[PDB]
PDB file of N, CA, C and O and ligand atoms in Angstrom:
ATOM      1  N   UNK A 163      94.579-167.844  -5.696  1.00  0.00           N
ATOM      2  CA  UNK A 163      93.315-168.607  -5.492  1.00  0.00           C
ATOM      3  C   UNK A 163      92.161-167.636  -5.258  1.00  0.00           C
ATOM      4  O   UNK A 163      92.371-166.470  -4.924  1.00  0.00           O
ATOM      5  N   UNK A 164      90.947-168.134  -5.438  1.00  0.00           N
ATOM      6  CA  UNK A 164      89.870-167.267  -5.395  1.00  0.00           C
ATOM      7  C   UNK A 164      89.901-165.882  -6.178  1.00  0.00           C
ATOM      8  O   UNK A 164      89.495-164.825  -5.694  1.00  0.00           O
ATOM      9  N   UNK A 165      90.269-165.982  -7.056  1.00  0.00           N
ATOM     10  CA  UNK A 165      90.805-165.255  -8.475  1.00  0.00           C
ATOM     11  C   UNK A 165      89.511-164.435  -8.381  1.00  0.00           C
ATOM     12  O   UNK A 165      89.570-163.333  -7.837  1.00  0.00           O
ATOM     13  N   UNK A 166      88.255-164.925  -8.910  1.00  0.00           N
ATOM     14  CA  UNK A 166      86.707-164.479  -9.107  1.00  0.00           C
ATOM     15  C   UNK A 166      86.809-164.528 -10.880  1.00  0.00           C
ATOM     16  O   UNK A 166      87.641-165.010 -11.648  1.00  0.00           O
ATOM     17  N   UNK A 167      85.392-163.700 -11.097  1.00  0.00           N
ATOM     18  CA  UNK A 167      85.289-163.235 -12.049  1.00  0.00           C
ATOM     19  C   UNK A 167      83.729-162.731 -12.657  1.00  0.00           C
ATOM     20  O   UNK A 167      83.520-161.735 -13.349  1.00  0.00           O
ATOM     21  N   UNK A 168      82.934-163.525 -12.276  1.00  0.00           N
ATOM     22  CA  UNK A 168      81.826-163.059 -12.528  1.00  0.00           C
ATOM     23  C   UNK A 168      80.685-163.859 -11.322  1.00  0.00           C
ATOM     24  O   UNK A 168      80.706-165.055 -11.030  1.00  0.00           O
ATOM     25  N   UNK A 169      79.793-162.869 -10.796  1.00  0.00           N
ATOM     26  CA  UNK A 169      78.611-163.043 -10.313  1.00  0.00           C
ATOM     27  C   UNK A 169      77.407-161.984  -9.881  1.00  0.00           C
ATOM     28  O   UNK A 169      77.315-161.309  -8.855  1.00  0.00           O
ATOM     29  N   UNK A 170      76.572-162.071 -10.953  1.00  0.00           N
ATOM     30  CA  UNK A 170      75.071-161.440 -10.459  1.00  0.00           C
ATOM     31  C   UNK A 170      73.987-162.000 -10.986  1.00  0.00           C
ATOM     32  O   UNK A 170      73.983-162.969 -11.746  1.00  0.00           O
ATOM     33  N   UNK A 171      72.716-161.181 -10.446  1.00  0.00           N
ATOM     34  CA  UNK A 171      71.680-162.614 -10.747  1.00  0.00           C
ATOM     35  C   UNK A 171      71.107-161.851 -11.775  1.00  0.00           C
ATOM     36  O   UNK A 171      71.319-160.641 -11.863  1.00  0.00           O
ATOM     37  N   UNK A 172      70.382-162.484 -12.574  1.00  0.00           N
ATOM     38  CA  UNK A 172      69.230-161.938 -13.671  1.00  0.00           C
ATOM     39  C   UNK A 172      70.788-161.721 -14.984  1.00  0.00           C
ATOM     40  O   UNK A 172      71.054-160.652 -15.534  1.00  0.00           O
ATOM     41  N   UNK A 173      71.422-162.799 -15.151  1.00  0.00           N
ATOM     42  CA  UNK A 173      72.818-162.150 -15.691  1.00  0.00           C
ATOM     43  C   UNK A 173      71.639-162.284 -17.589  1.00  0.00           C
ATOM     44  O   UNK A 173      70.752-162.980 -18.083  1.00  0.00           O
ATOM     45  N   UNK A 174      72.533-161.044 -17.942  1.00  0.00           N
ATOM     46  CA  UNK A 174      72.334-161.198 -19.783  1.00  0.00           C
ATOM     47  C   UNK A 174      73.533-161.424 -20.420  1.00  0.00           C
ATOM     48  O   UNK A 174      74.596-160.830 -20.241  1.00  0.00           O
ATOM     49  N   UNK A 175      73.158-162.790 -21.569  1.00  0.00           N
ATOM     50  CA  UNK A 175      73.808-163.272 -22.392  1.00  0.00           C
ATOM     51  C   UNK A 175      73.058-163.130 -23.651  1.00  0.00           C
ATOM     52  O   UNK A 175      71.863-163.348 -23.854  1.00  0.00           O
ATOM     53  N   UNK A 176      74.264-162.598 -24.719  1.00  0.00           N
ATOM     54  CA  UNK A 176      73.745-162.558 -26.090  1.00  0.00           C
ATOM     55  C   UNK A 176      74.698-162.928 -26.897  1.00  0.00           C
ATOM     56  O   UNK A 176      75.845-162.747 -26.489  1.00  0.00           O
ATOM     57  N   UNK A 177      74.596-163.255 -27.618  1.00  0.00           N
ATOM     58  CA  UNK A 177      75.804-163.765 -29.213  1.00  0.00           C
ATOM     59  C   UNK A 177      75.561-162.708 -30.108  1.00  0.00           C
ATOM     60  O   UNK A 177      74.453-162.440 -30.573  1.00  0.00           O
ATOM     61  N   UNK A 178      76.671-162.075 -30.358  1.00  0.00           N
ATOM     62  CA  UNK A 178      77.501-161.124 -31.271  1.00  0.00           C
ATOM     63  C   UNK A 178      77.061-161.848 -32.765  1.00  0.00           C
ATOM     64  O   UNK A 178      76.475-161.180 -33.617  1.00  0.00           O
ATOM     65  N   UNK A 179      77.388-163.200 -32.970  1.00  0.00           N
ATOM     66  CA  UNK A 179      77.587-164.012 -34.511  1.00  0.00           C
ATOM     67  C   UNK A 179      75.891-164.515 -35.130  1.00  0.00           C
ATOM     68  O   UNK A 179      75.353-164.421 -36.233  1.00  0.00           O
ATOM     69  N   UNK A 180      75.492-165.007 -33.941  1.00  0.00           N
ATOM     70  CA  UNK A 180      73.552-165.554 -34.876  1.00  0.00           C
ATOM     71  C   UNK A 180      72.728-165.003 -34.142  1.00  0.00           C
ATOM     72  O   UNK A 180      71.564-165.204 -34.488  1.00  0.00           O
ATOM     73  N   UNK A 181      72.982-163.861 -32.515  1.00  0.00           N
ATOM     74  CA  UNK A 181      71.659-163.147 -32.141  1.00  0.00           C
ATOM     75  C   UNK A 181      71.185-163.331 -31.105  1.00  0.00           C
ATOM     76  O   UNK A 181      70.531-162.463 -30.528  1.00  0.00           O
ATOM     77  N   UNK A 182      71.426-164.632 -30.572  1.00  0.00           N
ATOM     78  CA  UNK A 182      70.268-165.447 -29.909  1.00  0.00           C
ATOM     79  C   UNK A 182      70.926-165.777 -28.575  1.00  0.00           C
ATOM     80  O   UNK A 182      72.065-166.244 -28.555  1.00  0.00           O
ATOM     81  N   UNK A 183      70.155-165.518 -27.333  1.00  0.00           N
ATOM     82  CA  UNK A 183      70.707-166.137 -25.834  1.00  0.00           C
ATOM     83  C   UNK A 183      70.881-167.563 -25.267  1.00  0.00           C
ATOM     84  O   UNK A 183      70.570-168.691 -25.648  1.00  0.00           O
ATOM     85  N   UNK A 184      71.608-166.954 -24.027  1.00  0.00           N
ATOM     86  CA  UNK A 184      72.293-167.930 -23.527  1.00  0.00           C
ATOM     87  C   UNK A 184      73.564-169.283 -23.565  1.00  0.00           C
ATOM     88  O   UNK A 184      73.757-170.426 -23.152  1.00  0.00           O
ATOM     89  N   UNK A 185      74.530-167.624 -24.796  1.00  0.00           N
ATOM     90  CA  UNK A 185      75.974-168.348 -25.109  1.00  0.00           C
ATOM     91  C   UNK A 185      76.180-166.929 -25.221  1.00  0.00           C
ATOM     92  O   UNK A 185      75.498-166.000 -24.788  1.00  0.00           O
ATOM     93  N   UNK A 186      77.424-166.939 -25.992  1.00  0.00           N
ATOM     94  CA  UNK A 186      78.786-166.157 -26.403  1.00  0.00           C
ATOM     95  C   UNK A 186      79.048-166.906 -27.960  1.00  0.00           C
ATOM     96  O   UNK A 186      78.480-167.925 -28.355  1.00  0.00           O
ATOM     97  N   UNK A 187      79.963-166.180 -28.631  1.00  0.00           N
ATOM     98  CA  UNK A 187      80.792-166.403 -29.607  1.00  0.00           C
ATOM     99  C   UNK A 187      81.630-167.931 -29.888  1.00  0.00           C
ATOM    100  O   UNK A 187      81.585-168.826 -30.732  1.00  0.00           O
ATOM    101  N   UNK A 188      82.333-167.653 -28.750  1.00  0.00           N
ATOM    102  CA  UNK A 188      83.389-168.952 -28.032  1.00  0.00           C
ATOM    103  C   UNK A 188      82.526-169.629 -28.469  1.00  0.00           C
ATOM    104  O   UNK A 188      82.492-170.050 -29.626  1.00  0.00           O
ATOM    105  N   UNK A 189      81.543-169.871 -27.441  1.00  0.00           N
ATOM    106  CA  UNK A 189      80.813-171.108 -27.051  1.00  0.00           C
ATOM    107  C   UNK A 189      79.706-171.337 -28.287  1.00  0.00           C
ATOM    108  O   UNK A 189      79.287-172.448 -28.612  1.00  0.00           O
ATOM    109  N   UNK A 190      79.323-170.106 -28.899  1.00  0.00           N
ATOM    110  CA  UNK A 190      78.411-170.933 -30.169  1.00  0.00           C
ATOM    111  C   UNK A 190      79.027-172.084 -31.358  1.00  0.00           C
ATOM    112  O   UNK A 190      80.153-172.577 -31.410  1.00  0.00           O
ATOM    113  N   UNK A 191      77.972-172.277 -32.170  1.00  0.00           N
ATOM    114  CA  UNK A 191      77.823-173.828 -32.796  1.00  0.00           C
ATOM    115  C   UNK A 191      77.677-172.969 -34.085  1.00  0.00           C
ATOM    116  O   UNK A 191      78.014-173.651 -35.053  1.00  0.00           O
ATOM    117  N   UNK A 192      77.323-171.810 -34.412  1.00  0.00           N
ATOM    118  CA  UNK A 192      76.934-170.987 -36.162  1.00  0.00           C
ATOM    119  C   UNK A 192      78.274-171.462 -36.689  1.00  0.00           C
ATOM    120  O   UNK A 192      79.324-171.912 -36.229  1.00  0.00           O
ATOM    121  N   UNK A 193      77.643-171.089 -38.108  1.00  0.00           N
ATOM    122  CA  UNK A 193      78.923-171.118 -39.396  1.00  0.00           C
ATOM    123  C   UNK A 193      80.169-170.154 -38.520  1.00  0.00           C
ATOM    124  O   UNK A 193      79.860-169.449 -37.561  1.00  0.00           O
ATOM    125  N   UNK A 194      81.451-170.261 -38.987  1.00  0.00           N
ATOM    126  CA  UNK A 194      82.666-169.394 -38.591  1.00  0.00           C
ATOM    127  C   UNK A 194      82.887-168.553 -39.311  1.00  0.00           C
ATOM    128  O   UNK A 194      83.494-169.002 -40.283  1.00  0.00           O
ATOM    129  N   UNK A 195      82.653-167.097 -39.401  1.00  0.00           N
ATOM    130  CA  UNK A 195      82.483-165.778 -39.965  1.00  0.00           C
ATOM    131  C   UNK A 195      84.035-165.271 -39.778  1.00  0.00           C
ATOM    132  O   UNK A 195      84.826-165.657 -38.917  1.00  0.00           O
ATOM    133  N   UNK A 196      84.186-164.616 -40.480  1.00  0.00           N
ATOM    134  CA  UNK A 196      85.451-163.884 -40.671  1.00  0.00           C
ATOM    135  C   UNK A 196      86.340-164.946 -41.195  1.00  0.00           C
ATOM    136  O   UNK A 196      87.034-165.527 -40.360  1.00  0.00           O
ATOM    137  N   UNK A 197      86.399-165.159 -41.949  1.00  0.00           N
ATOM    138  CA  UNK A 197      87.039-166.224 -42.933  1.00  0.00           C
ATOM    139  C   UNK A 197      86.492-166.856 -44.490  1.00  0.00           C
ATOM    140  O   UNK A 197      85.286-166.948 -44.721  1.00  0.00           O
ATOM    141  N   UNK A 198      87.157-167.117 -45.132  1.00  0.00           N
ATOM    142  CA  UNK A 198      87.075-167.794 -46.352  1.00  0.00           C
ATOM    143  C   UNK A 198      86.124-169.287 -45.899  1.00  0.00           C
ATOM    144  O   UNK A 198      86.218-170.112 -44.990  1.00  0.00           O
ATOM    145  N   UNK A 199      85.329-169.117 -46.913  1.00  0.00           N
ATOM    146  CA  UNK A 199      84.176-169.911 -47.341  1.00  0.00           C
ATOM    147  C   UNK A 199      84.769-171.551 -47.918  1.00  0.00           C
ATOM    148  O   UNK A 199      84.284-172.642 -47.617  1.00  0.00           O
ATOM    149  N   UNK A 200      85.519-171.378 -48.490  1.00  0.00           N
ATOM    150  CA  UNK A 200      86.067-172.161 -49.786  1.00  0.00           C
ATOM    151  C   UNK A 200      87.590-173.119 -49.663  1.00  0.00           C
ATOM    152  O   UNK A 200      88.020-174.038 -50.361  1.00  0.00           O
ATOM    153  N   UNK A 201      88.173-172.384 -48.370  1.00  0.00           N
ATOM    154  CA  UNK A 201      89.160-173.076 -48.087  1.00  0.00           C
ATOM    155  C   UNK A 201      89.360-173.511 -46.342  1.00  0.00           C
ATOM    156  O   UNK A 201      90.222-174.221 -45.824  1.00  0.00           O
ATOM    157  N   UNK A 202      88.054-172.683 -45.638  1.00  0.00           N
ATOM    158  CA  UNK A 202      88.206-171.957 -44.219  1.00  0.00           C
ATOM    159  C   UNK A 202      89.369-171.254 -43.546  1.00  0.00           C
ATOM    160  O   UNK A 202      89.417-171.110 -42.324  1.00  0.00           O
ATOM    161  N   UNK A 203      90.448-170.753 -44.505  1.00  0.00           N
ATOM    162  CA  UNK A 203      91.744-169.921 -43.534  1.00  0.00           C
ATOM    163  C   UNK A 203      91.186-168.225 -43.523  1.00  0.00           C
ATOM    164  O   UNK A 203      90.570-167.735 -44.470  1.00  0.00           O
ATOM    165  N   UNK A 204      91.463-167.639 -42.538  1.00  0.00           N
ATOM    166  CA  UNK A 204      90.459-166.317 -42.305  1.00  0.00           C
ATOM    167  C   UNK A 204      91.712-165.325 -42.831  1.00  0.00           C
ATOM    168  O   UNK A 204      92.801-165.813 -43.133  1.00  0.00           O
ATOM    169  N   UNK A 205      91.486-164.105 -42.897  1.00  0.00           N
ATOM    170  CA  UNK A 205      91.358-162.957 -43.797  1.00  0.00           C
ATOM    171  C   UNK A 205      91.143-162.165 -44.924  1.00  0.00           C
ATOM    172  O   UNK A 205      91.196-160.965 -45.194  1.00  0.00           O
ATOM    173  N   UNK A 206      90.831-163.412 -45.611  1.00  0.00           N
ATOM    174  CA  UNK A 206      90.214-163.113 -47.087  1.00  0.00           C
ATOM    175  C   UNK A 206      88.803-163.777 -47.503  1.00  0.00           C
ATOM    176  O   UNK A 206      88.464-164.859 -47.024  1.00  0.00           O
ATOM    177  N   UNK A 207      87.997-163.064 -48.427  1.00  0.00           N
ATOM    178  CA  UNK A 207      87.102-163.388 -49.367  1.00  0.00           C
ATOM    179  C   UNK A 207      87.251-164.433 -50.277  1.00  0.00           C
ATOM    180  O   UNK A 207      88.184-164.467 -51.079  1.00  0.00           O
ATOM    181  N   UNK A 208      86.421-165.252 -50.203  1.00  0.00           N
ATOM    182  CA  UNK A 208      87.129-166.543 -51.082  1.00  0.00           C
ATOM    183  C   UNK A 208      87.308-166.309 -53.097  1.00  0.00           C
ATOM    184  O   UNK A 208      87.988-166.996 -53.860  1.00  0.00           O
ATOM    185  N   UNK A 209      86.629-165.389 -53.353  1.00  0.00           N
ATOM    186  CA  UNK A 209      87.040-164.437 -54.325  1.00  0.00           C
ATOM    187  C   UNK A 209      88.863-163.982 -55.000  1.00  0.00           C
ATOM    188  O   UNK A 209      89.448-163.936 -56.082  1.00  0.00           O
ATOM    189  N   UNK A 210      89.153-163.727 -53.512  1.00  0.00           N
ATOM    190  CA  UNK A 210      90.710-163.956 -53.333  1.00  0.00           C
ATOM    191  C   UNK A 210      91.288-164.858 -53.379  1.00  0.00           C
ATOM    192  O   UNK A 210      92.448-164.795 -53.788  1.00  0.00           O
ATOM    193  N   UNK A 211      90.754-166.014 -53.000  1.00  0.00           N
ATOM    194  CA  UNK A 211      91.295-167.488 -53.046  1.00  0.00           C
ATOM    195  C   UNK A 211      91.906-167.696 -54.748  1.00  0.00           C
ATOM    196  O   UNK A 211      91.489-168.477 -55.604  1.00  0.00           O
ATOM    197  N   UNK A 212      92.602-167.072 -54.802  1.00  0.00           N
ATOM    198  CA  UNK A 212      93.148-167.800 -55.815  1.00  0.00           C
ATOM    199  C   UNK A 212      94.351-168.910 -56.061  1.00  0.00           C
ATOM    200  O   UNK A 212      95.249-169.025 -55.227  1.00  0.00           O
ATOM    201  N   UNK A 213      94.310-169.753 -57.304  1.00  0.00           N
ATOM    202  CA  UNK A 213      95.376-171.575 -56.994  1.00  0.00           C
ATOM    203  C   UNK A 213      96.235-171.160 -56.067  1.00  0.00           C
ATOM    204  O   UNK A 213      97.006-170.200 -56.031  1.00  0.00           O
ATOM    205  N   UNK A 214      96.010-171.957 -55.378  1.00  0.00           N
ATOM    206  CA  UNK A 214      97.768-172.073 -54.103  1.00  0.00           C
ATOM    207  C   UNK A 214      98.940-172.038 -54.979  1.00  0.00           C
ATOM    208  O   UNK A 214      99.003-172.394 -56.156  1.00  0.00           O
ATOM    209  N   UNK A 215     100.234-171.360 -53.926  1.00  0.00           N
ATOM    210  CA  UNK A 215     101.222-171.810 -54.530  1.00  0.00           C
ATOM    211  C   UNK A 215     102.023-173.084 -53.892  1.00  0.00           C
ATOM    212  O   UNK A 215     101.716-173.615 -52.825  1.00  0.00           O
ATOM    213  N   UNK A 216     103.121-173.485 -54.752  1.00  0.00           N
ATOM    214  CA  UNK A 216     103.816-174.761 -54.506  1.00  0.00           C
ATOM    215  C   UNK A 216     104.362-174.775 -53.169  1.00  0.00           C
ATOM    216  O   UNK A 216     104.936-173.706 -52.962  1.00  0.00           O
ATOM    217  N   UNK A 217     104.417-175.577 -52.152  1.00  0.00           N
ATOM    218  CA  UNK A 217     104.792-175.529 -50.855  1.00  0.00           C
ATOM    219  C   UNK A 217     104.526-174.123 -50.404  1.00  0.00           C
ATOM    220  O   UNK A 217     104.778-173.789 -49.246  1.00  0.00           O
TER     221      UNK A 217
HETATM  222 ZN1  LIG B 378      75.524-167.682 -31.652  1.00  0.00          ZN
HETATM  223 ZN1  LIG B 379      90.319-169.414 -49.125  1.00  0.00          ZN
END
């Protein structure tokens, strides 16, 4: 109990993904980067996306 984790005043928050304060990554609402465009499963370029296979 009383684990902690964060407290100071004047705290800075910035987002890594669109720039802009008062979030994080987690918590933003932007498009989802690092992933395919075309199917949304992440590690490839949707370029790569090529036809699925059967099951
Ligand atoms: Zn953001
Ligand atoms: Zn894809």
């Amino acid at each position: 109990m009383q684990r902690g984790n964060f407290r100071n005043q004047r705290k800075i928050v910035k987002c890594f993904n669109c720039g802009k304060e008062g979030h994080t990554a987690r918590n933003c609402r932007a498009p989802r980067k690092k992933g395919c465009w075309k199917c949304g499963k992440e590690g490839h370029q949707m370029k790569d996306c090529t036809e699925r296979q059967a099951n």
